[PDB]
């Protein structure tokens, strides 16, 4: 097709949710929320990545929401725009 995910293997929300097994205890956003917004854990710090656009987000702050940070930084992502 005319779009292609940066990480097909994380195409699945369940696969994204599993990536948070070792999400650090200081990281306040939930795996549930992050996986739902297309994001999976890269294994480094609190850094996640979008399966679709491949954008990465880290150093989350209080009051941050996963979808609004995803859309703010990567507004042309097909997952963002398909929501």
């Amino acid at each position: 097709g005319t779009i292609y995910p940066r990480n097909p293997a994380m195409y699945s929300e369940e696969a994204r949710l599993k990536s948070f097994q070792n999400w650090p205890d200081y990281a306040h956003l939930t795996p549930r929320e992050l996986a739902s917004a297309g994001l999976y854990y890269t294994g480094i710090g609190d850094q996640v990545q979008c399966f679709a656009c491949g954008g990465k987000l880290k150093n989350w702050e209080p009051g941050d929401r996963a979808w609004s940070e995803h859309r703010r930084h990567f507004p042309n992502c097909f997952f963002v725009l398909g929501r």
């Binding site: 987000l57 880290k58 989350w60 941050d64 990567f74």
Partner: peptide, 4 residues
């Protein structure tokens, strides 16, 4: 967050 910051774009990494």
């Amino acid at each position: 967050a910051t774009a990494a």
